[PDB]
Amino acid sequence: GGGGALPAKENEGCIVSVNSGKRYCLPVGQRSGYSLPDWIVGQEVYVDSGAKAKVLLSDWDNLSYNRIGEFVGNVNPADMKKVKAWNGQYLDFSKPRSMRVVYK
C-alpha cells in the first residue's frame, strides 16, 4: 500500500479494490469460500501481501482447474493481468473469484 494504508501483516495476504481501497485479507493457511464475498468478487483488485505470504488467485470459482496465479509483495494493478498460471496459460487475475494465502 501507499502512505497511510495499513500494511499487510507478515503472514497475511490481501486483495485491495482498485476503485475503493477496501480490502479482503486472509492469513497464511486459509482460503476463501467457493467464491469471494459478493462485495469484492470479480471486482478489479491488486495484491498486497506481507513478507512471508503468497496470494494464490483464480479468475474462476473454487481455485479450480489449475487456473492459479501467484502473487507476492505489493503488486501493481497492471501486473495482475497476463500472468503465468499453473495450467500453462497466461490469465487475467485482476478480477478474481477465489483466493488462498500460503507461505511464500
Binding site: 474462476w60 470459482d61 473454487n62 479450480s64 482447474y65 489449475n66
Partner: peptide, 8 residues
C-alpha cells in the same frame, strides 16, 4: 488432481 466447480 485440480479443484473443480459445480456442474450445470
Amino acid at each position: 488432481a485440480a479443484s473443480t466447480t459445480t456442474p450445470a
